Every structure is written in structure tokens, then in C-alpha cells.
Coordinates of C-alpha atoms and ligand atoms in Angstrom, one line a residue:
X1 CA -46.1 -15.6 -14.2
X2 CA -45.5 -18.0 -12.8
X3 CA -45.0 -19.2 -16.8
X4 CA -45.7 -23.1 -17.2
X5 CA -42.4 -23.8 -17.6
X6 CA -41.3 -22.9 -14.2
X7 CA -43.8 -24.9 -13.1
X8 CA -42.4 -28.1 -14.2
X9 CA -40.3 -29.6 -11.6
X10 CA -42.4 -29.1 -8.8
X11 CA -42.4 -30.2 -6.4
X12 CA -39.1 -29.9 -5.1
X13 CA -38.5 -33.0 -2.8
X14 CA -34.9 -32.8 -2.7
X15 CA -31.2 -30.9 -2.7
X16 CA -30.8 -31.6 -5.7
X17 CA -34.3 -30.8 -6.9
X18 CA -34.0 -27.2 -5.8
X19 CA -30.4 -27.6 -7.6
X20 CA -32.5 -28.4 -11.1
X21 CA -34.7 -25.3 -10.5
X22 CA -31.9 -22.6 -10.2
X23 CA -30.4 -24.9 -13.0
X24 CA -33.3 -24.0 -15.2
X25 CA -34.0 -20.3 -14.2
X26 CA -30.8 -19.8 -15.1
X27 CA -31.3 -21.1 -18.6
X28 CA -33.9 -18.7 -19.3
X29 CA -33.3 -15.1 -20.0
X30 CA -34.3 -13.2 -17.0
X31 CA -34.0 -15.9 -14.0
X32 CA -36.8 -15.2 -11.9
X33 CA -36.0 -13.7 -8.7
X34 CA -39.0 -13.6 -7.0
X35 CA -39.8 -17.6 -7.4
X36 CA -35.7 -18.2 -6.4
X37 CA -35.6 -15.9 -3.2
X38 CA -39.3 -17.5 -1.9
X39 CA -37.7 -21.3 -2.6
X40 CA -34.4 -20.7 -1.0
X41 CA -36.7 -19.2 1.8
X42 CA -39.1 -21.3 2.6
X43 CA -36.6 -24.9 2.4
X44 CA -34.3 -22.1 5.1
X45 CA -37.4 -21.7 7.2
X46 CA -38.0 -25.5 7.6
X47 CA -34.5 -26.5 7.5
X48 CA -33.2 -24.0 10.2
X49 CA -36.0 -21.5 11.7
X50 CA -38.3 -24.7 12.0
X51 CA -37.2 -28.3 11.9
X52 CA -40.6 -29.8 13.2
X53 CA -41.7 -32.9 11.5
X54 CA -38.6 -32.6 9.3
X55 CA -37.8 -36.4 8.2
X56 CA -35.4 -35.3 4.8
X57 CA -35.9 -32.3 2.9
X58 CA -38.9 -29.8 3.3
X59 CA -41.0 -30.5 0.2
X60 CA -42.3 -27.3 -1.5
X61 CA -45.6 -27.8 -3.6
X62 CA -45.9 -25.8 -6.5
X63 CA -49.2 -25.0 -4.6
X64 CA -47.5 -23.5 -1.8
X65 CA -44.7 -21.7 -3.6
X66 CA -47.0 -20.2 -6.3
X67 CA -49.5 -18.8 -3.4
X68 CA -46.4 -17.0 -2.0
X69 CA -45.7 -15.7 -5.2
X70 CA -48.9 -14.5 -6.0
X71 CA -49.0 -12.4 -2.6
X72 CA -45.7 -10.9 -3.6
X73 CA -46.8 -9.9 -6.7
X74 CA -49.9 -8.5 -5.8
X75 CA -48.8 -6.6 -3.0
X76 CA -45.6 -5.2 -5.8
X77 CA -48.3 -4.8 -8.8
X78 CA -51.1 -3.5 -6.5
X79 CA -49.2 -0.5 -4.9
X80 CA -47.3 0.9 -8.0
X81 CA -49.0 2.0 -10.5
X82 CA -46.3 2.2 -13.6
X83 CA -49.0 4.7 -15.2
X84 CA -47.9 7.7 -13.1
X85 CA -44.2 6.9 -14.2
X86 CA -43.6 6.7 -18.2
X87 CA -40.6 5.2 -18.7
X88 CA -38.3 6.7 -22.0
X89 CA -35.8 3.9 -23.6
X90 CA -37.3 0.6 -21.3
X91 CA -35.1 2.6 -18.5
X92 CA -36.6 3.3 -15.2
X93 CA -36.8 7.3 -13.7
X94 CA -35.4 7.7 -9.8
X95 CA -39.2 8.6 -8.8
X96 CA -40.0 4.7 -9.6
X97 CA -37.6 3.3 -8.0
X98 CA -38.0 5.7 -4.9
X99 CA -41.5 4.4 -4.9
X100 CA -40.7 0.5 -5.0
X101 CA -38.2 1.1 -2.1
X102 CA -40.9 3.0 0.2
X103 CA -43.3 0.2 -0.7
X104 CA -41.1 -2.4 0.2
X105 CA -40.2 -0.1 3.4
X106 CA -43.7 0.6 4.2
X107 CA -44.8 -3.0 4.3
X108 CA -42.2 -3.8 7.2
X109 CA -42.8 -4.3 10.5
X110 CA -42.5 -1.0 12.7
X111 CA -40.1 -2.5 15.3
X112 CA -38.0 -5.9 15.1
X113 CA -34.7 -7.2 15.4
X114 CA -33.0 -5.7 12.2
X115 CA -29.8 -8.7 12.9
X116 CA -31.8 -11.8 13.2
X117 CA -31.0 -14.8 11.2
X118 CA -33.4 -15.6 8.3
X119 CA -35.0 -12.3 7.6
X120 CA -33.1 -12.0 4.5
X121 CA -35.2 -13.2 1.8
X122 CA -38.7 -12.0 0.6
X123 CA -39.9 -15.8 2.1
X124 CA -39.3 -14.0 5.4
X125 CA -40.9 -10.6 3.7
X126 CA -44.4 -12.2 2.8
X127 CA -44.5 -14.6 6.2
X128 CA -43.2 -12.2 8.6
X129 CA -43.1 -8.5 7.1
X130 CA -39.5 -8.9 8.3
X131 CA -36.2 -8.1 6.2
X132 CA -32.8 -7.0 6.9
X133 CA -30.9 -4.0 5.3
X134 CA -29.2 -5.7 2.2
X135 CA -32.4 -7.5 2.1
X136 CA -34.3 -5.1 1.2
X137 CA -32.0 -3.8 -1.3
X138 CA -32.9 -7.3 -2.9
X139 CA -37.0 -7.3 -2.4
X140 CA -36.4 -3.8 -4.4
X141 CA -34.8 -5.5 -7.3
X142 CA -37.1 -8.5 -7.4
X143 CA -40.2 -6.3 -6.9
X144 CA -38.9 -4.0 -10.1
X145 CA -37.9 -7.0 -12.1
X146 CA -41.8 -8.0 -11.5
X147 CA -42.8 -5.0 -12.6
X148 CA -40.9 -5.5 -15.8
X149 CA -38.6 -3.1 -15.1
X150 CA -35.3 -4.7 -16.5
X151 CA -32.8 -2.2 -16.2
X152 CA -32.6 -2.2 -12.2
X153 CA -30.2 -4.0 -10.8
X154 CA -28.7 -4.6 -7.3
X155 CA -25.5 -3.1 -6.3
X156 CA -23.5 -4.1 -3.8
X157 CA -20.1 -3.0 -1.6
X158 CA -18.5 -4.8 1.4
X159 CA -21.0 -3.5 3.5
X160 CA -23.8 -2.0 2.2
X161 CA -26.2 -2.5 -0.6
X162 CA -28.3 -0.3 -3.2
X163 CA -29.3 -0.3 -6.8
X164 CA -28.6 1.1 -10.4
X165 CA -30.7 2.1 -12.9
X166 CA -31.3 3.8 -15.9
X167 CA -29.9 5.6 -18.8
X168 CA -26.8 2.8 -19.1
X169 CA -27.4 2.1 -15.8
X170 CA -25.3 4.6 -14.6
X171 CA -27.6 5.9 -12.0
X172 CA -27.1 5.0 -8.6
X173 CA -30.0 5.0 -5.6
X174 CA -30.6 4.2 -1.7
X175 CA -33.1 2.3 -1.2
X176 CA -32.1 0.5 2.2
X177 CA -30.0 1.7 5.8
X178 CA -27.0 0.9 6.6
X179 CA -26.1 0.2 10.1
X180 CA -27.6 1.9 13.0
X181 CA -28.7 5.3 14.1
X182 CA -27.1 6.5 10.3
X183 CA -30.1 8.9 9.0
X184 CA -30.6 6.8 5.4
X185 CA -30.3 8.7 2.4
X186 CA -33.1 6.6 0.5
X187 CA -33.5 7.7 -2.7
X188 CA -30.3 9.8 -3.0
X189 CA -27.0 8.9 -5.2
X190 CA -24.1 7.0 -4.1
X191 CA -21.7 10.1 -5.4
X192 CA -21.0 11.7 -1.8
X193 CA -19.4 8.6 0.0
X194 CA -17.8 7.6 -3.8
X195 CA -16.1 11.3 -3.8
X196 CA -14.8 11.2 0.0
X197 CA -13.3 7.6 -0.6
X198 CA -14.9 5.8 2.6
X199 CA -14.3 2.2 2.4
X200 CA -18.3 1.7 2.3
X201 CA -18.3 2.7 -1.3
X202 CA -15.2 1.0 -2.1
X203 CA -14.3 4.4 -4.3
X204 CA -16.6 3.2 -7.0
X205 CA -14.9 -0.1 -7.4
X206 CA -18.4 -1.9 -6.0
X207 CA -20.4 -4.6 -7.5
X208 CA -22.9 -3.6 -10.7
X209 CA -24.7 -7.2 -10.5
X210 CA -26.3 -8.4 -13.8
X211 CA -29.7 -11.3 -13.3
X212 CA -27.2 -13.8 -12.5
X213 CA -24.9 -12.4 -10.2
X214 CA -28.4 -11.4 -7.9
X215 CA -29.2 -14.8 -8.4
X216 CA -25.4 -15.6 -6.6
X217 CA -25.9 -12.7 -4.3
X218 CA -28.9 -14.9 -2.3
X219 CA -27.3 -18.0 -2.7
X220 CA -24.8 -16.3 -0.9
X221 CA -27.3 -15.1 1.7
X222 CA -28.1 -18.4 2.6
X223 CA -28.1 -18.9 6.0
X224 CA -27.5 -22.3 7.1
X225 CA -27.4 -21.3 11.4
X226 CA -29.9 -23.0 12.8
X227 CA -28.2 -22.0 16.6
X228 CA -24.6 -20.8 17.7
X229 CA -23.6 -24.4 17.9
X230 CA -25.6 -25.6 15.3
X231 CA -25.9 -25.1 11.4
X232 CA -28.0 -26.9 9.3
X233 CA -26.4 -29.9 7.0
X234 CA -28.9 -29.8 4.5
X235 CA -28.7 -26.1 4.1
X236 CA -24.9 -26.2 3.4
X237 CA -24.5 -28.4 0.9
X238 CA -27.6 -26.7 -0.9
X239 CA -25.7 -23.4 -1.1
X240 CA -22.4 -25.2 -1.8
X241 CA -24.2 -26.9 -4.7
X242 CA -26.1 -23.4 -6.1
X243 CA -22.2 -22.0 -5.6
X244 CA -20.9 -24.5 -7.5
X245 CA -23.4 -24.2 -10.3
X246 CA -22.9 -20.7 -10.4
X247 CA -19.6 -21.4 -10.6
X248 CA -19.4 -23.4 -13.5
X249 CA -21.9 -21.2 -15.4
X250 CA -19.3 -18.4 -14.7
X251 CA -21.9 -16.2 -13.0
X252 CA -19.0 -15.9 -10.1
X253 CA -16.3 -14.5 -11.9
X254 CA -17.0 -10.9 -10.8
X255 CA -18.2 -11.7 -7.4
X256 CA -14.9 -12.2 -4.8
X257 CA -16.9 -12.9 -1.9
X258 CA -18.6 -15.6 -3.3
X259 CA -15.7 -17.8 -4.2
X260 CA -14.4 -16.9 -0.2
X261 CA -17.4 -18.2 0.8
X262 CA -16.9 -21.1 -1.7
X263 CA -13.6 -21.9 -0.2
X264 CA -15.2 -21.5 3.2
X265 CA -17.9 -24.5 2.6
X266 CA -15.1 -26.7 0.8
X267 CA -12.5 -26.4 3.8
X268 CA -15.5 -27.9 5.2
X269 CA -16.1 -30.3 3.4
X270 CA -14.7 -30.4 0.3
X271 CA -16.2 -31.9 -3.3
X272 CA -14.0 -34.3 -4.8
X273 CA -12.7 -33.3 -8.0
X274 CA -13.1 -29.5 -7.2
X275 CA -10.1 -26.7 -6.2
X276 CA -9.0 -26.6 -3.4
X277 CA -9.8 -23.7 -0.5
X278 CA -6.7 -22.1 -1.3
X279 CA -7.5 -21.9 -5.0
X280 CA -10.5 -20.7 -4.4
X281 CA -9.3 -17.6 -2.2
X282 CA -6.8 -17.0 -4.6
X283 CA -9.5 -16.9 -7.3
X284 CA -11.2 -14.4 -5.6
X285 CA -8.7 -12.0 -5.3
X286 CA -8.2 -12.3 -8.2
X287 CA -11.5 -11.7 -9.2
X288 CA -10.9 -8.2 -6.8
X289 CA -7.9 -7.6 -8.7
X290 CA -9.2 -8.0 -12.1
X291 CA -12.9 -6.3 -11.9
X292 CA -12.6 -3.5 -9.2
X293 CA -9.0 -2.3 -10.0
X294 CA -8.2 -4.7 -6.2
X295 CA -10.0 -2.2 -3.9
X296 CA -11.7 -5.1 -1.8
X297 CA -10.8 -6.1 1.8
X298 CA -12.5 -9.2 2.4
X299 CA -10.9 -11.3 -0.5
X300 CA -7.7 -11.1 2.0
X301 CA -9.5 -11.5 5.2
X302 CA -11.0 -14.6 3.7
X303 CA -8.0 -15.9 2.9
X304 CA -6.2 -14.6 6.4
X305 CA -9.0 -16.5 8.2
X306 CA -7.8 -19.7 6.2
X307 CA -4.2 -19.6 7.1
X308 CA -4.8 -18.4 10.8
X309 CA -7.0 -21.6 11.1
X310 CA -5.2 -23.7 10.2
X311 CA -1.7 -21.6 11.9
X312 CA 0.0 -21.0 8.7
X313 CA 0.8 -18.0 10.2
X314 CA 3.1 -16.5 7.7
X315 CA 0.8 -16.8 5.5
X316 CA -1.9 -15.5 8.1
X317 CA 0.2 -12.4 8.4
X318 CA 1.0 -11.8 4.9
X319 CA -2.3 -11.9 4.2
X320 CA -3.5 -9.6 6.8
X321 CA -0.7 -7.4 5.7
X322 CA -2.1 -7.4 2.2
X323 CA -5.7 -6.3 3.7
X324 CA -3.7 -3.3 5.4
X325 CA -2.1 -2.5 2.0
X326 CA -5.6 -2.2 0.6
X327 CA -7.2 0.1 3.7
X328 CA -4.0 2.6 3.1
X329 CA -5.3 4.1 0.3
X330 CA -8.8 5.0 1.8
X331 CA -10.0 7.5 4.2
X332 CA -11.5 6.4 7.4
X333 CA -15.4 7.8 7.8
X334 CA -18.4 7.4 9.3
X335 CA -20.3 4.6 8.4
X336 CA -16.9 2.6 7.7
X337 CA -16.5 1.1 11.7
X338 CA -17.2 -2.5 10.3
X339 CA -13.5 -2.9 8.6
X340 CA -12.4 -0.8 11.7
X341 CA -13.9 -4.0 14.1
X342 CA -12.5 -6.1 11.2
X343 CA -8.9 -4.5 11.9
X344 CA -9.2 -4.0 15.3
X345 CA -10.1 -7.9 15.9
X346 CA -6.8 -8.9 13.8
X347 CA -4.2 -6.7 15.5
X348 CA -5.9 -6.8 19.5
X349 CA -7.2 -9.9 19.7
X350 CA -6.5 -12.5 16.5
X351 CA -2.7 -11.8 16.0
X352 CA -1.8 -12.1 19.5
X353 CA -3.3 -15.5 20.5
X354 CA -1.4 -16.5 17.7
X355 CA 1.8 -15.3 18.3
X356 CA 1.1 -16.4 21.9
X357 CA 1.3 -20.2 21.0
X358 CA 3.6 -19.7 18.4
X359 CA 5.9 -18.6 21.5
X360 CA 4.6 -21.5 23.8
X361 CA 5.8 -24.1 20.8
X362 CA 8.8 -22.6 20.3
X363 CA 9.5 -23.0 23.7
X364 CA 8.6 -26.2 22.8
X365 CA 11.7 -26.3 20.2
X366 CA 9.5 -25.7 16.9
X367 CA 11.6 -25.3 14.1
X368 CA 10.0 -23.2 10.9
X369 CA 8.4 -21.1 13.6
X370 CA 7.1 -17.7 12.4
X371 CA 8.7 -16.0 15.3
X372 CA 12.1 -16.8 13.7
X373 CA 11.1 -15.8 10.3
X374 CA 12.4 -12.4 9.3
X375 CA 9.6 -12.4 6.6
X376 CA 7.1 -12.7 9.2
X377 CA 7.9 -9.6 11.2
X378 CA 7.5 -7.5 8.2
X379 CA 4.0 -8.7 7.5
X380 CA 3.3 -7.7 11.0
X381 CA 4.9 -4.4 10.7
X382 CA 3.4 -4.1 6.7
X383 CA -0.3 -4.7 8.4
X384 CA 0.4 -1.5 11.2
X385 CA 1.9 1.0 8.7
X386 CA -1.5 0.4 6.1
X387 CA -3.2 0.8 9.3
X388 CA -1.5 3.8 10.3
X389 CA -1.6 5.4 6.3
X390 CA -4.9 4.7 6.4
X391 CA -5.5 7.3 9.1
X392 CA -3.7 9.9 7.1
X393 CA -6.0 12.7 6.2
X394 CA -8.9 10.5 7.7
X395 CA -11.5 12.5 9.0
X396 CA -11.7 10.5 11.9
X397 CA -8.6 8.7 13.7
X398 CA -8.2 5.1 13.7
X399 CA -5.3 4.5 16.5
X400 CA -5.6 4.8 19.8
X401 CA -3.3 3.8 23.2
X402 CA -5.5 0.3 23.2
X403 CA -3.7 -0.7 20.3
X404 CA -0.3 0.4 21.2
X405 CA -0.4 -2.3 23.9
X406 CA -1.2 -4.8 21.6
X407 CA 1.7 -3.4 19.1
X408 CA 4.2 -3.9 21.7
X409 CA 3.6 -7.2 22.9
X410 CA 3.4 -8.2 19.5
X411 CA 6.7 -7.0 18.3
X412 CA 8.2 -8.3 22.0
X413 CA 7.5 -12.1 20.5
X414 CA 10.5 -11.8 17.8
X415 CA 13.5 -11.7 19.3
X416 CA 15.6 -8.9 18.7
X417 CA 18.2 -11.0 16.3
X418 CA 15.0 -11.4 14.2
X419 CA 14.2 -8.1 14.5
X420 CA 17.4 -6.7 13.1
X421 CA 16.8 -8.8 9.9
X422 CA 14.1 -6.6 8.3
X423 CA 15.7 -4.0 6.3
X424 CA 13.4 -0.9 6.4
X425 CA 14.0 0.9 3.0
X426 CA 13.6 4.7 2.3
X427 CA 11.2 5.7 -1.1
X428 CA 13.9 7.3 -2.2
X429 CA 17.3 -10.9 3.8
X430 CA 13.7 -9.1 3.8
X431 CA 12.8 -5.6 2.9
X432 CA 10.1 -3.6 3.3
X433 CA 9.3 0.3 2.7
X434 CA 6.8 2.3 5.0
X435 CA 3.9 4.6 3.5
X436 CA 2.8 5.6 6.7
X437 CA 4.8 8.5 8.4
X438 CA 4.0 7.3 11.9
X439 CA 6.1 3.8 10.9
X440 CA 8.8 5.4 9.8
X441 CA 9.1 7.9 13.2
X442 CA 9.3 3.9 14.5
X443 CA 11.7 2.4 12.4
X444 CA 14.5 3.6 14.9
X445 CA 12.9 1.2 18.1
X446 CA 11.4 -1.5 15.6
X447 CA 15.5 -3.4 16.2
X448 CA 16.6 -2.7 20.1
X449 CA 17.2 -5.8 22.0
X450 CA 14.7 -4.6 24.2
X451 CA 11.5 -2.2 23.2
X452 CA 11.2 1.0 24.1
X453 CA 7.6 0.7 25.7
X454 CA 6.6 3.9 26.1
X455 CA 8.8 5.4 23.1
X456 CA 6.6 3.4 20.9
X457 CA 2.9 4.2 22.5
X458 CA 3.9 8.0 22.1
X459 CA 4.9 7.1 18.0
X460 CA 2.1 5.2 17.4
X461 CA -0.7 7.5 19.1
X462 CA 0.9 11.0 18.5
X463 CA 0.5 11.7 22.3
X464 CA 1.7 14.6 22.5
X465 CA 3.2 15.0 26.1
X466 CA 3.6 12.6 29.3
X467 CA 2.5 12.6 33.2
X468 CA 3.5 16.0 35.0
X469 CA 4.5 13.4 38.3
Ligands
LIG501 N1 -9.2 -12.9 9.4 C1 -10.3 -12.8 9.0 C2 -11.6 -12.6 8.5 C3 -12.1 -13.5 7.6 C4 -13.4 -13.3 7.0 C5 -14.1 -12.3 7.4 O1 -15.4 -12.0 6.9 C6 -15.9 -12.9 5.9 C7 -17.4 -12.7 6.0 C8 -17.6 -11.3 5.2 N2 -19.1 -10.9 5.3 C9 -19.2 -9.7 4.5 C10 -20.6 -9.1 4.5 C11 -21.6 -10.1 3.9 C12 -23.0 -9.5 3.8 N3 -23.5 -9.1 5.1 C13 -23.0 -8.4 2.8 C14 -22.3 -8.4 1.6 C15 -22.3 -7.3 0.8 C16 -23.1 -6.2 1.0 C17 -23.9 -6.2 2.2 C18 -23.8 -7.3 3.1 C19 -23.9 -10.7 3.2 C20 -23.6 -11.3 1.9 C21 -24.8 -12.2 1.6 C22 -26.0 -11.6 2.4 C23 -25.4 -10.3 3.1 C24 -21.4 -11.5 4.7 C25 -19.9 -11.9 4.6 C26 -13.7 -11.4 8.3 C27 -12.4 -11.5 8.9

């Protein structure tokens, strides 16, 4: 409306206040998005974009808020005209929703930067005709649930985000980009990049959000940075608050990335009373494991992050092992180079400044160390063959010499007697199996006393033939 009944706590002076308000929408039947995504907006903007004259919390007037709203809505109402689309069965046709996302498209900016902080809600749509790409996903749903159109609804993988709509809501549409220099597909199904198994569309196994789990989704997007040194106090404890609402309301039980992010704010500073990180990452995998069949990456990364921290690493490795053992059963394609950075950063750059001072303090006579842990060197070598079976059949490759570098000095840091611990078991304390064929052409170097350097660079990268002099 704004209905008189969300008009009733305003203003919010307060954390908590703003707390009560997502409290309250989330009573109600339909929790409004549009009044939700222009509050968390405008306390971001004066909490984080502009602190000037801040002396607590960033009062928002119903005054103000509802003005915003009512330039949302008219620009949403004014520009689609529901007339020229009958809808059968209260479901929306793909020509409506085609025509939502060019009006939300139309009304940006013609050149920005698309990766700046705090363009993400549709505070930073109405102030500075500025949103980013899974932000405008959003403006689409909340636009369409203004226009009463119920059954659209945002959807949402790893790394990119659209909607579904209709009949059952079983129809999928583009409404955003993804990345850069990617023609979009706006207005076109999901079913191509679903049918060729890229990670971007998690083969199917993506997020269908209900209300409440949009509601989650820009709690989520909260973006407490005020600089690279600096995030925003306030901000964090707001969205670990809304997190742990939606967390007791159970709007978070489908969402994985939510509880990492949880976990994230409660290593923090944790809530007394509340799980522990740990619990929390576990949570969310098991979320991933439960709802989409365990086809998600980050829940392990999230978790790998933890451990790697605070130099558990076993538990580091295993855990970056068990993000490998999800890759391995995708195919490698365009559009996917995010979770190839992700990968990339773990084995060339992450793993080995941890296994560098895992060396320096044994040196130091550490006892425990990872680098005398059998178990250990098979996570390492479990996180390179779902690398290397993930490649299989890929369209594109994933290895390269680069990494083979980084592969030898990191098996160099167990000592040979470690080395020879692993048992490597054949389909048909330790003991591992390899998928990938390229690990098992390696199995025969993975134990000498010393590595066979160049033996294990032509393994990993196929190379073919070496130098003529
Ligand atoms: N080791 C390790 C490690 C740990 C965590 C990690 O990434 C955790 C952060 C994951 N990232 C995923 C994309 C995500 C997001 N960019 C996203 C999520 C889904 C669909 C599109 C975009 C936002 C979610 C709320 C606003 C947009 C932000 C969080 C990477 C490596």
C-alpha cells in the first residue's frame, strides 16, 4: 500500500527496530519486499555509503520510506500496463515478466561501475538508477510482487540469479547478466546451461525461493563494507540479527549460503546461547545435501575458509577436498570461471602458504602437524583428482603448467615416509580411490623419496612432448 499496518512502528530509530519490522512482514502473508529492500537500503546508505552526522542509528520516517516507495511503485505501476497481458490461473505469461525485466533494465543508468558496493537494493535503484546483476533479478521480483503478480519468484545458483514463474512455477526466465562481456539471454529459459551441466546452473539443483527465502536473500545482500579496512558495526549485527530471525522462523533451512554466512558473522562475534560456527557450516551442508541432492560448492568453501583460518588444516583440506568431490561431476564451461578463480586461489595460492608454515613449525618440532598426517595428504591429493575429473569431457580445460608447479611443491612438503602411507585403491592406514584418469597415470610418482618434477608436470598437463635441445 503501504497498508496501515506496516505503518505502525515507524519510525525505526534503532537495530532492533528495523529487527521488529522484518519481524512483522514476516507475520503477514506476502512480506513486502519493496518496503524491506528500501529499509535495509536506506539504514546501508547512512550506515556505510554515508556516515555524516551519524550519532547512533539512521532514523527512517515513515515519511521518507513511504515517499521512496511510492516512486517505486509508480515508476513499476506506471510502465506496465497488466491490461495488455491477461493472466490464466493468477499465473504470470513469459511476455510479462520480459516486460518487468526491460523496465527495470531500462531505468538504469547507461554506464556505471556494475561491482560497486551498495548498489544492490532498489534503495540504490530509486536514489541512483544503479543496481548490480543479482540485483536486478530482485527489483524484478519485488516490482512483480507489486504488481500483484504472486507466482514470480527469484531463483538463485552460486553465481547467477533469475526467476520462475508460472504454470507451477515451473518456468524459468533471464532477466539479469551474468558477468562480463556474456551476451545475456534475457528473457530466455534456463534449460541450455541446466542440459550441458555447467556449474552456473548447478544441474538444476538451484534455489526456487518462496516470500521468505527473498526476504533471506537481501538480508544476505547486506553489505556492511564501509572501506577495505572498514565495515560497518551497526550494519553487522543488523544482518546477524535478520539471519537469526530468519533462522528461527525456519525461512533458512533451504538456503546453505545463508547459514555460511551465519557462521561467518558468529566467528566474529558470536551470540551467546547460539551454535557455534562450526554448527552452522555443518548445517549448511546439510541444507546442500538435503534440498539440492549436495550439488553446491560454497557450503565447503565456507567451511574450508573456517578451518584454514584458524589452521585446522586437516580439516581445511578435507574440506577443500570435499569442494573437489562436488566440481567432478560437472563440466567446466563458459560462464563458470568464478569456481575456476575459487579453485585456482585454493590450490596456487591458499594451500601453499599453508603448508609453508606448517613446514616452518614443524621445523619448529610441532607435533600433530598435518604434514605428518597420512590423512592429510589424501585430502590434498582427493582435492587435485576432482579437479582433474572435473576437466573430463569439459568443453574447456581447467589444468594448465601454472598449476603443476604449485602441485609439486605441495606434495614436496610431506615427506616421503608420509607419502608411502596413503594406500591408492583401484575401483575394482588411509585409503583413497581416484576418479580422475590423470591421478591415476600419477599414483606411480605420488610415493618416491624424491618427486619426479618434470614426470609429474607432463601427467598433470598431458603435454605431449618435451624441449628438442
Ligand atoms: N576457502 C574458501 C572460501 C570460502 C568462502 C568463499 O566464498 C564465500 C562467499 C560466497 N559468495 C557467493 C556469491 C554471493 C552472491 N554474490 C550471489 C549469490 C547467489 C547468486 C548470485 C550472487 C551474493 C549473495 C547475496 C547478494 C549476492 C556472495 C557470497 C570462497 C572461498
Amino acid at each position: 500500500g503501504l497498508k496501515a499496518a506496516q505503518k505502525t512502528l515507524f519510525p525505526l530509530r534503532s537495530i532492533d527496530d528495523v529487527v521488529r519490522l522484518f519481524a512483522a512482514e514476516l507475520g503477514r502473508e506476502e512480506p513486502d519486499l519493496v518496503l524491506l529492500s528500501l529499509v535495509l537500503g536506506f539504514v546501508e546508505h547512512f550506515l556505510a555509503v554515508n556516515r555524516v552526522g551519524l550519532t547512533y542509528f539512521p532514523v527512517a520516517d515513515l515519511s521518507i520510506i513511504a515517499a521512496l516507495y511510492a516512486r517505486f511503485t509508480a515508476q513499476i505501476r506506471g510502465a506496465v500496463d497488466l491490461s495488455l497481458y491477461p493472466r490464466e490461473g493468477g499465473v504470470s505469461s513469459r511476455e510479462l515478466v520480459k516486460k518487468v525485466s526491460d523496465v527495470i533494465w531500462n531505468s538504469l543508468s547507461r554506464s556505471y561501475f556494475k561491482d560497486r558496493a551498495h548498489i544492490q537494493s532498489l534503495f540504490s535503484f530509486i536514489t541512483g538508477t544503479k543496481l548490480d546483476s543479482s540485483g536486478v533479478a530482485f527489483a524484478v521480483v519485488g516490482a512483480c510482487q507489486a504488481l500483484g503478480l504472486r507466482d514470480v519468484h527469484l531463483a538463485l545458483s552460486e553465481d547467477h540469479a533469475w526467476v520462475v514463474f508460472g504454470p507451477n512455477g515451473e518456468q524459468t526466465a533471464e532477466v539479469t547478466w551474468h558477468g562480463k562481456g556474456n551476451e545475456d539471454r534475457r528473457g530466455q529459459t534456463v534449460n541450455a546451461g541446466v542440459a550441458e551441466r555447467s556449474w552456473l546452473y548447478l544441474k538444476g539443483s538451484y534455489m526456487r525461493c518462496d516470500r521468505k527465502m527473498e526476504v533471506a536473500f537481501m538480508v544476505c545482500a547486506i553489505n556492511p563494507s564501509i572501506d577495505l579496512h572498514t565495515d560497518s558495526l551497526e550494519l553487522l549485527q543488523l544482518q546477524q540479527k535478520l539471519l537469526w530471525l530468519l533462522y528461527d522462523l525456519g525461512h533458512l533451512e533451504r538456503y546453505p549460503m545463508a547459514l555460511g554466512n551465519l557462521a561467518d558473522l558468529e566467528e566474529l562475534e558470536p551470540t551467546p546461547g547460539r551454535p557455534d560456527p562450526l554448527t552452522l557450516y555443518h548445517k549448511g551442508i546439510a541444507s546442500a545435501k538435503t534440498y539440492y541432492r549436495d550439488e553446491h560448492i560454497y557450503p565447503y568453501m565456507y567451511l574450508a575458509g573456517y578451518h584454514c583460518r584458524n589452521r585446522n588444516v586437516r580439516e581445511a583440506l578435507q574440506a577443500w577436498a570435499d569442494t573437489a568431490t562436488v566440481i567432478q561431476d560437472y563440466n567446466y564451461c563458459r560462464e563458470d570461471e568464478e569456481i575456476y578463480k575459487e579453485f585456482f586461489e585454493v590450490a596456487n595460492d591458499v594451500i601453499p602458504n599453508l603448508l609453508k608454515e606448517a613446514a616452518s613449525l614443524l621445523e619448529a618440532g610441532s607435533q600433530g602437524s598435518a604434514l605428518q598426517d597420512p590423512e592429510c595428504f589424501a585430502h590434498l591429493l582427493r582435492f587435485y583428482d576432482g579437479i582433474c575429473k572435473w576437466e573430463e569431457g569439459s568443453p574447456t580445460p581447467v589444468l594448465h603448467v601454472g598449476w603443476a608447479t604449485f602441485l609439486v611443491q605441495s606434495l614436496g612438503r610431506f615427506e616421503g615416509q608420509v607419502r608411502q602411507k596413503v594406500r591408492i585403491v583401484s575401483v575394482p592406514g588411509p585409503v583413497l580411490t581416484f576418479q580422475s584418469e590423470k591421478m591415476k597415470g600419477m599414483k606411480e610418482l605420488l610415493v618416491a623419496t624424491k618427486i619426479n618434477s618434470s614426470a609429474i608436470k607432463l601427467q598433470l598437463t598431458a603435454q605431449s612432448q618435451v624441449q628438442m635441445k
